[PDB]
Amino acid sequence: RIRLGKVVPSSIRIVLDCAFDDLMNDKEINSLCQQVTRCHSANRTALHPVELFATNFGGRLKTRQDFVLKGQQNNWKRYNPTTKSYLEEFESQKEKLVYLSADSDNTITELDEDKIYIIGAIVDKNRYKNLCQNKASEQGIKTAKLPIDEYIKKILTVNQVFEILSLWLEYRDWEKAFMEVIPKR
Ligand SMILES: Nc1ncnc2c1ncn2[C@@H]1O[C@H](CSCC[C@H](N)C(=O)O)[C@@H](O)[C@H]1O
Numbered sequence: 001r002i003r004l005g006k007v008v009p010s011s012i013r014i015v016l017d018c019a020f021d022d023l024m025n026d027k028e029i030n031s032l033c034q035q036v037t038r039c040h041s042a043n044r045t046a047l048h049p050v051e052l053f054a055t056n057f058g059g060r061l062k063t064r065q066d067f068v069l070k071g072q073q074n075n076w077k078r079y080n081p082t083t084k085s086y087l088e089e090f091e092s093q094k095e096k097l098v099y100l101s102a103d104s105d106n107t108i109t110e111l112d113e114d115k116i117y118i119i120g121a122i123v124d125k126n127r128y129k130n131l132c133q134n135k136a137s138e139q140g141i142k143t144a145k146l147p148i149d150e151y152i153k154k155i156l157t158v159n160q161v162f163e164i165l166s167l168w169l170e171y172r173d174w175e176k177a178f179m180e181v182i183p184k185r
Pocket residue numbers: 099100101102103118119120121122124125126127128129130131132133144145146148154155156157158161
């Protein structure tokens with residue numbers, strides 16, 4: 001993938017909701033940690049970097065991260081880890097939160113410059129169906145699935161979803177973003 005043109009930061013916040021440490025075994029945490037790192041790396045080279053948040057950040061994910069990265073995470077840019085939940089961190093902007101979920105009845109069609117998009121930070125192989133959908137509904141926050149159909153004909157990894165969002169900022173074309181991150185082959 002080649003990037004053309006001038007780097008212009010987006011005002012969008014993207015949140016990795018890291019509240020699910022207790023639902024994952026050791027391999028899954030290890031994988032998630034690699035995926036969080038890929039979100040930062042994809043953000044750094046993006047034509048429109050966003051502000052990346054990692055909320056409820058702690059526990060075995062935070063340990064693993066520092067074990068693997070050996071303190072390098074403390075050097076990352078446009079990156080905001082916090083023990084606060086997203087609901088805590090963005091209470092005043094609650095109306096602007098959108099939790100991305102494959103299980104939503106709603107479909108995202110554009111990323112709004114004034115909105116805050118949440119990705120569930122979990123590697124479960126989707127054995128926890130409706131998990132993120134349920135969490136956001138109980139909070140009264142809107143959810144949306146990626147407009148994958150009808151080029152998909154479903155549940156992507158944390159970093160795949162991040163990468164797709166970031167590429168949409170660049171191209172403003174979902175088909176191109178999908179073609180780049182999940183080519184049919
Ligand atoms: N088709 C899709 N549309 C929107 N978000 C998706 C998606 N596939 C994956 N995701 C995102 O990637 C994250 C990890 S995969 C999710 C597994 C979990 N069973 C769940 O309930 O969400 C999700 O939390 C969601 O934020």
